Amino acid sequence: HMLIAEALELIAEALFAIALALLAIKKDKELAKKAVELAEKVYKEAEELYKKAKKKGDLIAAALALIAQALAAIALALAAIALKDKELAKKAYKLAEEVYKKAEKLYEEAKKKGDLIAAALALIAQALALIALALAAIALGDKEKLKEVIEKAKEVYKKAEELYKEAEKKGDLIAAALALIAQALALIAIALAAIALGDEETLKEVKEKAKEVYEKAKKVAEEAEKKGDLIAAALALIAQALALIAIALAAIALGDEEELKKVIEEAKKVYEEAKKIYEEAKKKGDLIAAALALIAQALALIAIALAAIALGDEETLEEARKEAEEVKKEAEELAKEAEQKGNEIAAALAEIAIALAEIAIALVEIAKK
């Protein structure tokens, strides 16, 4: 359980570098270089953790190590846009390609052994790596690289759909929710690539397919709540928020103001539902499920922030910023309670919610002036 908690801490550190790169978009070159140095350090540390997890046979810890590697490449690509550095954008592209190739081998090994949870996490690392490739290709202006992102992301979407159906037939609702997370992240990679290419039809297909993921995640959350699995229910709410982020990105490029207003309404329902799961998880003592509920709250506020910025809704933007600070304070209290009871996994997951809430705050500051 120590290798899993170590990888989750590296995930939170990678998200901290993303917020640093997002804040540099203030237009500060030295701030963008500080986010670069943190991203390369997290990438190297997660590489050593991946080798240790593979040496011990912990496929779950090895997959989480690759997820931190993909988030480190995303921060490197975001710094490339702020610095206009094509040489550094090429390095982020190369590092993201190595994560995609490593996660592909791990997904095959986990599928043959029956570990559906580890296989779903490997697909999440592939989808996150494709987001880094899309951002790096945008900084380079490579139309050939943008088309490769769309083709690879379609393979991740198809692999996650087969894994979701297999997990649903076996009753593994945790792996089924993780498979829907990889689908929503893969659609985000396509949306970013289709925007730079100006593909209206592909953006229209992302919107309808993300709605299908949103409806499937609502069914998993209701089934997990009936069985008493609050961990799977919180993961299903995370997939709901990530699917709404993909719909917002597509509605932004297509100029669908009515769809953006529906995203805010739906994301508010996910945020309120995640608050009920948090109260139920804390009452029964499930600190891992409670931390995942705060993660779903932060992602739901990110979807609200993106839609309100494109709509110019300052009242809703101010509301999401206030709720983001409330999530950050609650996660700090949960981290103290988790370490007081020796639950290092929940303590690391609470740190991920803090970094996610800081990303939403950075998004609000980006639109201010």
Numbering used by the authors: -1 to 23, 25 to 368
What does the paper say about this structure?
Here we describe efficient routes starting from validated parallel and antiparallel peptide assemblies to design two families of α-helical barrel proteins with central channels that bind small molecules. Computational designs are seeded by the sequences and structures of defined de novo oligomeric barrel-forming peptides, and adjacent helices are connected by loop building. For targets with antiparallel helices, short loops are sufficient. However, targets with parallel helices require longer connectors; namely, an outer layer of helix–turn–helix–turn–helix motifs that are packed onto the barrels.
We chose four protein sequences with <85% sequence identity, high pLDDT and low Rosetta energies for gene synthesis and expression in E. coli. The other protein, named sc-CC-7-LI because of its a = Leu and d = Ile core, was helical and fully resistant to heat denaturation as judged by circular dichroism spectroscopy, was monomeric according to AUC and bound dye, consistent with an accessible channel. We solved a 2.5-Å resolution X-ray structure by molecular replacement using the AlphaFold2 model for sc-CC-7-LI. For the parallel targets, the experimental structures show minor fraying at the C termini of the inner helices compared with the seeds and models, which appears to improve the packing of the external three-helix bundles. However, the symmetry of the central parallel helices is maintained. The backbone RMSD values for the repeating helix–turn–helix–turn–helix motifs are ≤0.5 Å, which is expected given the low sequence variation in the loops and the hydrophobic cores of these buttressing helices. Finally, to test the robustness of the design to mutation, we substituted all 49 a (Leu) and d (Ile) sites of the central α-helical barrel for alternative design rules for parallel heptameric α-helical barrels (that is, a = Ile and = Val). This protein (sc-CC-7-IV) was highly expressed and was also folded, as shown by circular dichroism spectroscopy and SEC-SAXS, hyperstable, monomeric and bound the reporter dye. The success rate for making single-chain constructs from these initial five parallel designs was three soluble proteins (60%) and one new α-helical barrel crystal structure (20%).
